[PDB]
Design a protein around this ligand. Structure first.
Ligand SMILES: Nc1ccc(-c2ccco2)cc1NC(=O)c1ccc(-c2cn(CS(=O)(=O)c3ccccc3)nn2)cc1
Ligand SMILES: Nc1ccc(-c2ccco2)cc1NC(=O)c1ccc(-c2cn(CS(=O)(=O)c3ccccc3)nn2)cc1
Ligand SMILES: Nc1ccc(-c2ccco2)cc1NC(=O)c1ccc(-c2cn(CS(=O)(=O)c3ccccc3)nn2)cc1
Ligand SMILES: [Ca+2]
Ligand SMILES: [Ca+2]
Ligand SMILES: [Ca+2]
Ligand SMILES: [Ca+2]
Ligand SMILES: [Ca+2]
Ligand SMILES: [Ca+2]
Ligand SMILES: [Zn+2]
Ligand SMILES: [Zn+2]
Ligand SMILES: [Zn+2]
Lengths: 367, 368, 367
C-alpha cells in the first residue's frame, strides 16, 4: 500500500513553557510512546529531523524577529522590553529555556517532510510536533513562534503548482491564511470556532484578495459541534474543493483542541470523528503532510494522534490500550476511544446549511 | 444613526483666480456647492458662512513675519518684495494673486469655525470643502497652499481633546500637517499617497515621527494606478487598527480629490464611490469629525466627489442622474454623478499592498 | 578591511533598447537603489564614471567601428544600411537613442576601475554597467557594442604581467577569449552552457593558440546546474589556476543570466551559489575588478548584484528587503535570496568530474 515517513526528536518532550502554561510539549512524547507500543513503528520509517536553520526560517519570517528569538533568554528580558512588545513575546508566548531550539525541531520535521514528498520518496509524512499555525512574519501569537506550516508549504511549492492546506484545529489558522492570502497557488480551508474567541479572524466573508480571491475558505462555527454535524460539512466541502481546485499536494493540520473535553476548546468531537477527516483526505490519493497543532487535554491528544497515525497506515488498532510508559494517565478505562460530552451543540441546522451554501457559491467562482 | 452636519461655504470663494494656466481653480468649490444645492442637500444640513480668520488666529501656528508678508503682498507691489517672495516661497507654484490674503482667511475660517462647533458639541460633523491646505509650512507657502487651515483647526481641537487623529486621502503626502505634529503624540497623522519622484518628496513609510511623536506618524506609500478594490482593502484595516491602538476623541479627514481617476495632475484610478468609501469607514467610528477639501484638478470630478461625500455624511442616497445646475455642461458627455475608472495599469500589486500594511501594523504594535 | 570602489552613472537606467528587447539597463538603477536602501553606500567609495573617449575605445576596437557607433542614430539609419550590416548593428543589437553615450558610460566605469587598481588606490573596483563580453574588435554581438572588459584588461596589463579573467555569465565570453587567445599574459576561464546555445563557442577543446596555448580554459555545462554542483567545480578549478598561473590581478564578470528563473538562461543557481564565486576569488587577496554581464529577470539581477556588493564589502545583509523605489518588483516574497526551481540538473556528477579532470590535465601543461 502507501509509504509513511514519521518525524520525532526525543528531546521535544523536554521543553517547558512555564508553570501553569497550558501548552505541554510532553504530549508529543506521550503520543510517540503510545504509538510505539501499538507496534506502528514496524510499519513506518522513523526519522530524527535536522534542526531548521535560522536562514531557513527567514524564508518567511523577518530577520530581526528570528535574530530576536535566537537571542532572548529568561535572564536577559530586561534589555529587550521594546523588542518583546514589537514581536509579542513575553506573555502568552513566553520566553523559556531552549525556545529557539524548540522552534528548530518543530520546523525541521515539517520542512524535512515536505522535502521527502517533493522527492517522491514517500506518500505521507507526519510531524506531530508541527502545526504552529498562528505565528506571523514578525510576531509570535497563540503559543506559536515560527510558522513551520508556511515554511513547509513554501518548500512544496518548488515542485507543486497547487497546494491545499486544511485546518481542523479549533482555532482559525490565521498565520497560514495571511501568508497565502493573495495567491492562488495555495488554497487554505479552515474550520474553527468563531465569535468572541481567539484569534478573532476567519469570518465567512474572508475569501482572499488579488489573484488569491476565492482561494481562502473559512467555516466559522459555534460551541458544541459534534461528530455527525462536523462530518456532514467536512466531506462535502473538501470534496468540492478537491474537484474545483485540483491540488497536487495536501497539508493537513490536525490540531486536537477540537476534541470533546479539551481544556481550552469548546467542541464535542471524538477521536473517531476527528480522524474521519484524515480518512476523507486520504481517499484522494495525493502526497500528504500531516501536522499537529493545539491540544490541551494531553491524554486525549495522545489517543487522537495515535489513532490518526494508524489511519494513515491503514491499520485497525484495538480499543484496549497496550501497556506504555504513561499507562496510568489513561485511566480509569485505559481505552483508545473517548465519549462525547452532553454539551449543547449551538450550531443549528439552518446556520450550518446557510454557511455551506455560501461556501459552495464561492467555490463555483474558481477557474 | 444619522448625524447633525454643519457645512461652511463662502459664495465669494469661487472668484479667486490663481492666474492663467494655473491648475488650482477655486471655482470648483462653487461648482460643488451648486451641485449639492441642486440635489436638495441644503434641506438636510446647516449652511454657515465662514468668518475671515484673523492674523491672531493664523499665528497660533505660522510665523508673525510670514503672516505679515501674506497680508502685505499684492500684484502691484510685487517688485518691492522680490527678496521676501523667495524667502517665503511665493511667486511661482504659489503665485501672488488679487485677494490672496482674503482667500486664506476664508479657507481657514471655515476649518477653525468647524473645529469650534465640534468642541462645543454643537455638531457631530463639520464640512469645509474650501479647506484641506496640507502643504503649507510654518514660514513658507508650498504646493498652491499658503496657510495651513488643518494645523490651525487641529490646534483648536486640542483645546478640548487629548488625542486627535488626522487622515489624509489626497494623492500627495500631507507634509505640512505631519511636520507640525511630528514630535507629539497628541495628533497621530496617517497619510496614504503616491510616493517616488512625486511632489512633495516626503512620506516614506520609514518616517514614523520622533521623540514623544515616535510611532504617531503613519505613511502608506503607493505607486501609480491604484484602484477602488486595492485602496478599500487596506484603508479599512489600517484605520481600524489605528482607532483601536490610538483611541482618538476627534478626527480630521482631508478628502483631496486629486486621487480620483482622470485627475489632471494625479496618477491614481479611484472612482467617486471608492474615494467616498473612506468617508463611510471613518463615519462608522461615531467620533466628532471635521471633513476638509484638498487637491483636485479635473473640476467636474471634484464637484462630483465632494457632492457625493456630503450625501454620505448625511446618510442620503442621491440619484446618479445629475440635476440641472448652473454648471451642467461641465458634466458632459454623460451628465451622471458617478465616474468610471480608466484602463491604466495598477502598479500596486496585491502583495505590495499587504506587505506595506504588514510593516505599518508592526509599528502600530509599538503604541502603549 | 580591503577598500571597495563602485561606479554608477544615474543616467544609465534611462537607455532603452526598444520595445520587447530583453536587455533593460534599468536593472542597474534597481541594483543601485537596493544597495542604497540597504545602507551599503556608507561602506564604499561611489564614483560617477567619465564618458570613455573614442581614443580609449580604439585601444582595442577599430577606428572605423567606433566612428560608426558615434554617428549612427534612429533618424539617420536609412543612410547607413551597409555600415549597419558590416558592423552588425540594427537587429539583436539595435540602434537606439543615446547608444554611443551608453557605451561610453559602461566602458568608462571598467577602465576607471582598472586605473584605480593599477594605482593601488583600491583593492576592489565594481562596475555593474560593464561586462559586455560578446563585443568584437569591429562588430557588435549579443546586445554588446564596446568590449569594456577587453579595454579594462588592456589597462591592467600596463602594470600587471599576468591577469586572470573569470566569467560566470551563462554565455561563453567569446569577445574576451578571442582578444587574448594568442597571449599568455591573460588567462581566460569561462563556465557556460554549451550545445546549440549562443554564441556557439567555448568548447572544452578550445585551449588557446601560439604563445597562448593552454591559457584559455572553457568548462562547458548543460541545463540545470545547481549551487552544489557549480560550487564543487568552481573552487578546485580556480584554485588550480591560481596555483599554476599566479596572476597579479583578476577580472570577474558576474553575469546574472546564470541564475535560476532567468528569462533567457537555463541554469538553476541561487544568489548565494552565484555569490560564492565572488567569495572564492576574494580569498586570493589580489586586486579585483568585478563587472556585471547578462541577466534578464531584472528583480533577480538586482538581488544578485546587491548581494555580491555586500560580499565584496564583507557585510552580511538581511534577507528581508528594505523599502526602496522599486519595492513592488520583488513580490511576492520581498526577500533578497531566491529559491532554486525543480528543473532537472542535466550535469551528472560523472560528467562534472570528467570535464574537471580534462581541464586539470591542460592546466598541468603550464610552466
Ligand atoms: N491553535 C494552536 C495550534 C498549534 C499550537 C502550538 C503551539 C506550540 C506547538 O503547537 C498552538 C495553538 N494555540 C492555541 O491552541 C491557543 C489556545 C488559546 C489561546 C488563547 C488566548 N487567549 N485566550 N485563549 C491562544 C491560542
Ligand atoms: N495636495 C494639495 C491639497 C490642497 C491644495 C489646495 C491649494 C489651495 C486650496 O487647496 C493644493 C494641493 N497641492 C497639490 O495638489 C499639488 C499638485 C502638484 C504640485 C506640483 C508642483 N510641481 N509639480 N507638481 C504641487 C502641489
Ligand atoms: N552575455 C551577455 C553579457 C553582457 C551583456 C550586456 C549587454 C549590454 C549590457 O550587458 C549581454 C549579453 N548577452 C546575452 O546574455 C545574450 C543572450 C541571448 C542572446 C541570443 C541571441 N540569439 N538568441 N539568444 C545573445 C546574447
Ligand atoms: Ca481550524
Ligand atoms: Ca490563498
Ligand atoms: Ca495623502
Ligand atoms: Ca504626530
Ligand atoms: Ca561564462
Ligand atoms: Ca589567453
Ligand atoms: Zn488551536
Ligand atoms: Zn494633492
Ligand atoms: Zn549572458
Amino acid at each position: 500500500k502507501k509509504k509513511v515517513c514519521y518525524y520525532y526528536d526525543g528531546d521535544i518532550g523536554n521543553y517547558y513553557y512555564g508553570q501553569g502554561h497550558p501548552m505541554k510539549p510532553h504530549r508529543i512524547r506521550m503520543t510517540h510512546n503510545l504509538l510505539l507500543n501499538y507496534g506502528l513503528y514496524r510499519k513506518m520509517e522513523i526519522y530524527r529531523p535536522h534542526k531548521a536553520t535560522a536562514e531557513e526560517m527567514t524564508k518567511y519570517h523577518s530577520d530581526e524577529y528570528i535574530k530576536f528569538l535566537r537571542s532572548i533568554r529568561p535572564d536577559n528580558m530586561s534589555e529587550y522590553s521594546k523588542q518583546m512588545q514589537r514581536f509579542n513575546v513575553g506573555e502568552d508566548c513566553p520566553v523559556f529555556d531552549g525556545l529557539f531550539e524548540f522552534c528548530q525541531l518543530s520546523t525541521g520535521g515539517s520542512v524535512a517532510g515536505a522535502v521527502k514528498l517533493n522527492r517522491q520518496q514517500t506518500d505521507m509524512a507526519v510531524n506531530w510536533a508541527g502545526g504552529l499555525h498562528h505565528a506571523k512574519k514578525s510576531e509570535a501569537s497563540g503559543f506559536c513562534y515560527v510558522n513551520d506550516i508556511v515554511l513547509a508549504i513554501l518548500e512544496l511549492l518548488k515542485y507543486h503548482q497547487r497546494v491545499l492546506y486544511i485546518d481542523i484545529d479549533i482555532h482559525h489558522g490565521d498565520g497560514v491564511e495571511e501568508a497565502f492570502y493573495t495567491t492562488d497557488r495555495v488554497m487554505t480551508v479552515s474550520f474553527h470556532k468563531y465569535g468572541e474567541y481567539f484569534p478573532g479572524t476567519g469570518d465567512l466573508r474572508d475569501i482572499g484578495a488579488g489573484k488569491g480571491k476565492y482561494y481562502a475558505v473559512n467555516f466559522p462555527m459555534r460551541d458544541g459541534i459534534d461528530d455527525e454535524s462536523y462530518g456532514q460539512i467536512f466531506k462535502p466541502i473538501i470534496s468540492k474543493v478537491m474537484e474545483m481546485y485540483q491540488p497536487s499536494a495536501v497539508v493537513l493540520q490536525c490540531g486536537a483542541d477540537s476534541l470533546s473535553g479539551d481544556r481550552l476548546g469548546c467542541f464535542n468531537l471524538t477521536v473517531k470523528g476527528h480522524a474521519k477527516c484524515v480518512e476523507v483526505v486520504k481517499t484522494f490519493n495525493l502526497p500528504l503532510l500531516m501536522l499537529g497543532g493545539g491540544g490541551y487535554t494531553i491524554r486525549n491528544v495522545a489517543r487522537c494522534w495515535t489513532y490518526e497515525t494508524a489511519v494513515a497506515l491503514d491499520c485497525e488498532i484495538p480499543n484496549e490500550l497496550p501497556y506504555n510508559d504513561y499507562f496510568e494517565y489513561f485511566g480509569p478505562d485505559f481505552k483508545l476511544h473517548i465519549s462525547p460530552s452532553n454539551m449543547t451543540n449551538q450550531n443549528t441546522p439552518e446556520y450550518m446549511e446557510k454557511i455551506k451554501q455560501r461556501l459552495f457559491e464561492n467555490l463555483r467562482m474558481l477557474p
